[PDB]
Amino acid sequence: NEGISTIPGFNQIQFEGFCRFIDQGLTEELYKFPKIEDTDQEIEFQLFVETYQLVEPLIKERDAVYESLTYSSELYVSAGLIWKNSRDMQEQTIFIGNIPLMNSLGTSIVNGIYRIVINQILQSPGIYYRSELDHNGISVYTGTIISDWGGRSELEIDRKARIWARVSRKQKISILVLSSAMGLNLREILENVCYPEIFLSFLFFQQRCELGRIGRRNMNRRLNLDIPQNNTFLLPRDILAAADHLIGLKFGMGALDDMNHLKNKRIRSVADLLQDQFGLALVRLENVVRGTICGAIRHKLIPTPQNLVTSTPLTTTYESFFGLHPLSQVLDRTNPLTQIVHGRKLSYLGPGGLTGRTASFRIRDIHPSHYGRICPIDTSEGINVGLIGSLAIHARIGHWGSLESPFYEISERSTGVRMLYLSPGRDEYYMVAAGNSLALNQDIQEEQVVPARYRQEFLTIAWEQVHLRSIFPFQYFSIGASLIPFIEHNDANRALMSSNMQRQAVPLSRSEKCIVGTGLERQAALDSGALAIAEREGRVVYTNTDKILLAGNGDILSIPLVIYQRSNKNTCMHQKLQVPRGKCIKKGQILADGAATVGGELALGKNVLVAYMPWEGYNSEDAVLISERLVYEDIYTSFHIRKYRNLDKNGIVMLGSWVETGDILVETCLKLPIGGRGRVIDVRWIQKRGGSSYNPETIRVYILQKREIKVGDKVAGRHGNKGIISKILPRQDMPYLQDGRSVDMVFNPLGVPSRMNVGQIFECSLGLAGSLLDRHYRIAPFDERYEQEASRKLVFSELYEASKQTANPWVFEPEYPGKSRIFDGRTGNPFEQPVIIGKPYILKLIHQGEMEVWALEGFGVAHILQEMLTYKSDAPESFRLLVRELRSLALELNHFLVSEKNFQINRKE
Amino acid sequence: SRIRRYQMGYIKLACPVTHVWYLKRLPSYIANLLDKPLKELEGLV
């Protein structure tokens, strides 16, 4: 019932999926387990699903990661029914194996590595009736019946009846003979189907008939059958009705279907994958117990159900799944944003899915059914474009593998207000309008027009015909697209670029909140997992850097704190305290801060004073000329932790050692590579691997590198603006405003009309106004629905207020609002044109063949090409390799350099 | 150790065998040289 009044949690999908799995899938798989009956003289039992007990893990999460063990839960079932011939029930609680547990955030720790499970999109079983275009005659109508496994059975229609199937190798599969062989009488066959004239004139059970639960529903919805939901088998009446609908569509009575519609596609989750893996593990366990029974009857010894079963299949199956499956991926712990945007991904590719090049161009484009359910902006660039998408904010699975979106009823009913979740197929039949009611034209206010969406088409209708209404601002966008302020003034391409660049952000040493934000950073920091939230209410009696003690109703709860830990992508993690000692707290309130978070909000950058102007060509391309203040004031300083005379007696480098490029610490001794130098914070000896052996292959060492902002680093904003640092200038050489402050960064203005970004100017002006007024702004997207030119008023009012409260007339100048005149730092002369001045939120980024041979041959440099080829390869070595590889297949090659002087042949080997 | 990279070996076969792409492929040079359809020769082999 949650999510109808507020924004749902970012980890609710995987949470409910794992809950559904551990609630029903285990029992569903244990029910289909076969029974092994043997060992007459011996005492045994079968698999009785009556106990079904899961025990809590003995190890803790911290321990598991530290010692590289998977965190998992035990499974003890007392599967005892009756012996074979002893006539005495011997019930013993056997330990089948271990089942991995999911955290509250959705990550499972397997072998010490945080891993996530990405959802998958695929078509649903049913009939589709695609009208394939025919060159000769009428268009051939082919109806494909998809099964749960993935089978395809088509039915064609030519100019005549010509009802044939494509299941057989031949074109004509004798659909009449196929229906007769099904077991139905010919008279009943011709009497049941409508229009028996053309029917009379017309003269597998492993996966095809095994339709899924959703397949029966889809077939009963598309057709007019009333078969109960319990039946999951392809009945002959199904094929009869399919042929009837096909021959009716041939006459014009029918409607085609679109496979791109979300109602025709099903969304898989972690529950289905884990259930399939559990089924495979149960199959392996049945095989193992059958083998050990056949061995025990050979060895002539009465076995024990504990000794008869082995805990190997479940563990090895889950390990292989978490290690080699395309959907199972490692968690991206760069910043708190990648932790929350990684689980919301949808993948079209994978097992039983469309490939990269095999997928047609119609699958990648946006469909009208994707509104409010799949983000139209987020898309993985590259060859896999359009196949990787992000789930919307207000979206959930609808008990049928279908993703649904909330809507508000505006009809005169008993209640009048009910947030309904609508399946993509049911929402199409209602009038959905996204428009305000601020209009009055001397009428009843219900005769006014409003843009609405109906039958996947946009049209303007009166206010009496609308049924549903979308009222949430973040309903259509994902986490990345929502964190962009003033998104209405930018293109979607730059929105995608900004959503991609926000993932590549580095948590800095000291974090600061943005002056202008969207208002979703709070829930992002809440669902990130790097913030210590209180699990109980009480006063804080002891505050320390290592732990926090919370005293409630007598009980004292100890909460640890992360102090300079390493992420998966070389990023430091640290937590700071934000509550003094002796204050009251409630469940869900912040006790300690986190990395890239300050005050419970995401902080991925700093506020800097920025001017937009050309400066000596240093920003001709996309490039930034920054001030030297950002270097000695510790503004863009970050930490990075990498793992691999100073050597001790044993050989390991001691703590506090400052290694340099070329120094060895432990070929025989590990050496730090080029570009890596820092303080060795801690060293751990992996004497015992956990790989099932004690492997001191090596001792893990950690170095810390505080990387100051330098030339070549990439700085990017939240609107798609990207720049590479070109030069650092002193404070005295930078341009200065009329107040006397030197600007920090200088951006090129010509990029603004090129990439079509307008929101950055609004952000800069409003940030300057807020910095002068000591205010922070959190604006919801699409503020023009209130009034036309709302953002202009919001920015200019704050600018004028900052100009009138603090006596700074240069902030808001009437001749050119938003622009101010600045001076040169070298000569102290004003430029002849005003420039944009503001304080935007700048982020620091983490990232700092045959064509060449063709080009070299075009230039004419043969010796350079020869040298390059010999350097890349090392008679030449490539020729010897080729002649050996060819003579390995009974093929002889010779060079035979002929001399033009004496006319003799010389073989070169 | 380049002599090891350049040296090769040979294995004697008790029964003769036939090249992969000299027969099965659509251009059957042996069938074109023996004036016999592919069915019988495939059978002999």
């Binding site: 490039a623 070549g712 990439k714 700092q848 297949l889 | -």
Partner: peptide, 14 residues
Amino acid sequence: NGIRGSGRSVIVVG
């Protein structure tokens, strides 16, 4: 089966 089978760095403007 037998048949079938320099330092990269960013650039700035000077």
